[PDB]
Each structure stands twice: as C-alpha cells, then as structure tokens.
Design a protein around this ligand. Structure first.
Ligand SMILES: [Cl-]
Ligand SMILES: [Cl-]
Ligand SMILES: [Gd+3]
Lengths: 328, 316
C-alpha cells in the first residue's frame, strides 16, 4: 500500500517527482564506517550529499531511490541523516550488486530470499528501516550465482509486492535473459525495471521489453566521457555517448506509445570508493548539476523537442509511484 | 611497548599464555550487523564465544589474538563484549584476508598503508580500539594485489612496531614468497610469523625460515580432520633443531563462520569439541609426554607471544 522510506512510510501522493536509480555513496559493506577519511570524513560526505540533494529539491525532486545494496556499502543511517536534513524522501534497497562477499555468495536461493525478506519486512541491520525496492546486478551472461539472486528477488517481490530493479554490467543489454528468469518465477513484468537501458541504442530491444510491461530505466543520462577521451577509467564507466543521445531514447519510447513504461534518473552519487580513487571528481567535472541534471537539463531538452509537459510529469511522477507502490 | 587489546593497553606481564592465531567469528564486513540471524542471533554468538573463551581460560589461556581483518568481518565491539565477559584479553587485527571488497582491492600500496595505520594508530571504526597485529593472507602464487598488501603491511609494521602474521592458502609452502617481499621492504624477520606452517611436513623448509629469524606459526593443529599428533610433532622437531624461541602455537578456531558453507561451524565443532582449548588440553600434554620440559612449553606459549606482540620498531 504505502511506500517505505528511510524516514518511515509515505503515501503515494507524497512521492512526487522521483529519481528512480540513485545512490548517496557507492562503496563496500562496512567501508564507510572503517575508513571514513577515504571520503575526507563522514561529516564532509554528509555535507556534500545534503547540499546536492537540496539542489535537486529546489529543482523539483521530491523522492530518490537509493539502490545501494549491502555489498555496495549501503549505510542506511547515512541515508536517514541525509534524507532528514535535505527533506527529500529516500527509498532504501535490498538485493545483491556485483561485489558480494563470501558470506553472501556462498548462500542458497532460499537463504538469499530470507535475507531480502528480512530487510523488506523487518528492517535493515538494527534500525527498523525497511527496504522499498530490490536491486540486482548481472554481468553479460547471467552467472549461476546471479541466477540465484534473480530468483530470490522474484520470490521476495511476490511475497511483499516490492519492485525489482536490475542492470547488466559490461553489456549494452541483458534484459531478455533477466526477464526469462523473472517470468519463470511468476513475477509480473510490471514489478521489474530493466535499469541502465539507456546504455544501448537498440530501440527494437527496448520496445519489445516495454511492450511486455517491463519498466525501462533510462537512468544514466548525464554519464558521458565525451571530452575525457584521455581518461580510460572515465570512458569505461560513463561511455562515449552524449547525454542528449541517452535522453532521446526517452523521446523514442514516448513516440512508440510506451510513455507509461519509462523511468528516468541520473545514476549519481556523492562519494564512491568501489572504483578508482578520486573518480567522484571526474563525475563532478562532467555533471556539476549532480542529481539536479534530470529536472534542470533533460526535462527542458525534451520540452524543446516537443514532448508535452503532461507526458513528462507522467514519466517523473506517475510512473515511479505506480512502480514503487507495493503490488502483488 | 605495551600491547593494545580490545579493552585497552596491557603490560607484557599481563599477556600470559597466548593463542596467537584465533577468531571469534569468520565472516564478511558488515555481515554480522546485517544478518545476525544467520548465527541464530548476535546474543547466541556472544554466549557461545564467552563459554568457549571461559573454557580456554580455565585451561590456562589468558590472551588470544583475533587475526580477523576488515574483510573477514571483524566486529571489534563483539570482541570487546566477549573479552570482558570471559576475562580473556583479545588483540585485534588490521590487514587484508582473501575476500577484499572493491573498496579495498582497488587501492594502491600507499592507500593500504594509510588504512592499516589508521587501524593501528587511531582506532578501528569509531571505537578507539587499536589493532595490535597485521594479518595478510595470500594464495599459492602471490598476486599483484597481494604483493601490494604485503608491502603495505611491512610499511605499517615499520612505522608502528606491530608484528605481521601471514599464511598461504592452497600450498603447503609459500613462506619464501612473503619473506622475499618483506625483506625487500626492510622488515625484520623477527616481526613476522609465517602461519599455517603445520600444513607442511617439509621440516627443512621450516628450519630454514626459522634460521633466518622468522617465527613459525604452527597454528592449525586441530584442523587435521594426517593426524594432529603428526602436526604437533613438528613443534618437537623445531625445538630439537634449536628454534624453540621461533615457535608460535594456536588452534585457528572460531565460534561462528559465514564465509563458507552453511553449518560448517557444526562440522568444525564435531571434529574438535575442545575448541580453543585444544592446544592446552591436548597438544601441551602430548608434548610433555614426549619429553618436552615445562620451561620450554612455557617459553613457547608465554615468552614467545609476548616478544612477538610487544611493539618493537628496531630488531636486535
Ligand atoms: Cl548500482
Ligand atoms: Cl585468517
Ligand atoms: Gd584463520
């Protein structure tokens, strides 16, 4: 019914303009607590995230989905502190990303299902903060362990109504292999977002998934290493396609009649330790607008290309609310 | 020169009989906090650890070294609670084991040095508990990343005087690889224990390391599950070569484990019900029956660990 946030449950009407694929910090389990000075200090990270989220709020953002899992270093007390000080809703996540420690990757599908249910139904750690989404990541061809994760995600979603968001690393696609596993578990496509789908220009691929009822996450819009060709780490992380090319996939799916299947986001963050040192400075140099990039740059761009305001409000308000509202 | 424990600094005279390579829990960073029910509950893990440490204390143990690193799920607040309840000193560790997350394995040698120094000089997380040892694990062939870890460990040891303990996973030898890297950095062998050394029968290899000044960690004795007596006889063999001062003995035990198959703890407990008391209850009497004097046993279990753990920036 209602949606669980790091400040507690909110009604669908309170969700508002939502960014569906974000993070406060991209890290590893326990790392922010063990080496906060990697980020300058915990206090500096909080300050930067609060300033950044307040800017996004000024630009109209009301809710973000922090898809950070246990193994991406999710620190729900950090999310709570930042959500409260920025006065922006944050939905927390369960699931498994691409760096599970042994205590996770040795677990069975039944064990993973119980872990996800604990975080959704009881709370994360000892905080009582409950997850409102399940995040899964796969590599190219689904590994045996990643199939266990996808199946446990489907089983937790069916038990709680909470949605699933995915992405594929190092491959421009992946959604068709994921969708096959999800449907083999009886999961409705309307509970699944195929994330980072703006990494490809394969419109046939995107349209076919949308036509099955999947949500299409065009959610890395500002990521572009154009101009940073001499930084190989930036190219591998952000790609060589312009943000306008990513944004025009939004227009293309609208033009095909699938406005209701689109979710949009920046895939931003305010600190990152899981990649090369000081990569946050590289991303900040490419997109000083941070999480405000979507409302400030992409929305007017799509308006200039003729998309009605009503259609954009449906994509940024109505679709995420339908997605996040628990449904089974 | 005092030794840092999870309850603060203690003097050498308080260290007593020490188990130099142990764990309370073998896990992953953040896992005990995120899924305590995997262990039944946090309270159940505490109660089991306290009973196990009280049993070891009644067999004479006064200090354990918990060599669990960040990536093995070290929870220093758990260690502190168990140490207080059982009245057994616990020395905590920094370093890197075999499962570093991206935030660790993307780091440079200079960054890893700073991380170890933070945990030794300032404290672990926000607790003020300082590490008293650096643990490094490697695999058969040292990987490029493992070499960075070994060099960072040497640099942190040289800056603080705390010792380093290492082992090689998947090869009965391998100490030569670490020794060459450590010496290239200027680290004294007297600051280094080559652990899991009871996993080889090649006594010539252990003797050659002992002759270079390394400490020999005969610390997986009950993991035979090869008999434990044959492993324990390596202790007598090294004594008879004249290297009693270079021997450290332990169990490499723990009271919960999540980093392998589910219920592996039950397998472990079935083969060694003595837990951490295996060394004092089985190995020490066995060596005494084989004619090792009391004074030599006390040297190995009291004098050697205190010499090893006492921060020493300059070797004799
Ligand atoms: Cl992610
Ligand atoms: Cl270890
Ligand atoms: Gd061990």
């Amino acid at each position: 019914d209602r949606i669980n946030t790091v400040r507690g449950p909110i009604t669908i009407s309170e969700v508002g303009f939502t960014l569906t694929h974000e993070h406060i910090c991209g890290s590893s389990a326990g790392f922010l607590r063990a080496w906060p000075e990697f980020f300058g200090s915990r206090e500096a990270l909080v300050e930067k995230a609060v300033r950044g989220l307040r800017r996004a709020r000024a630009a109209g953002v009301r809710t973000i989905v922090d898809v950070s899992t246990f193994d991406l270093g999710r620190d729900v007390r950090l999310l709570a502190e930042v959500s409260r000080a920025a006065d922006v809703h944050i939905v927390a996540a369960t699931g498994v990303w691409l760096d599970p420690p042994l205590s996770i990757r040795m677990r069975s599908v039944e064990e993973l299902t119980q872990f996800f249910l604990r975080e959704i139904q009881y709370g994360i750690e000892d905080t009582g903060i409950r997850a409102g989404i399940i995040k899964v990541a796969i590599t190219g061809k689904v590994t045996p362990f990643q199939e266990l994760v996808l199946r446990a995600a489907a089983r937790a979603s069916l038990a709680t109504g909470v949605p699933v968001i995915t992405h594929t690393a190092g491959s421009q696609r992946g959604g068709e292999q994921q969708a096959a596993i999800f449907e083999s578990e009886g999961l409705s496509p309307s509970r699944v977002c195929i994330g980072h789908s703006d990494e490809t220009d394969d419109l046939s691929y995107l349209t076919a998934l949308a036509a099955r009822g999947y949500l299409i996450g065009l959610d890395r819009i500002p990521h572009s290493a154009i101009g940073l060709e001499d930084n190989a780490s930036a190219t591998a992380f952000m790609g060589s396609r312009s943000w306008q090319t990513r944004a025009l996939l939004i227009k293309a799916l609208i033009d095909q009649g699938y406005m209701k299947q689109i979710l949009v986001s920046n895939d931003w963050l305010f600190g990152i330790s899981s990649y090369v040192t000081n990569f946050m400075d590289v991303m900040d140099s490419v997109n000083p607008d941070g999480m405000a990039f979507i409302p400030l740059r992409v929305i007017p761009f799509l308006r200039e290309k003729g998309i009605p305001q009503e259609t954009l409000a449906g994509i940024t308000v109505t679709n995420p609310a339908r997605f996040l509202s628990p449904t089974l």
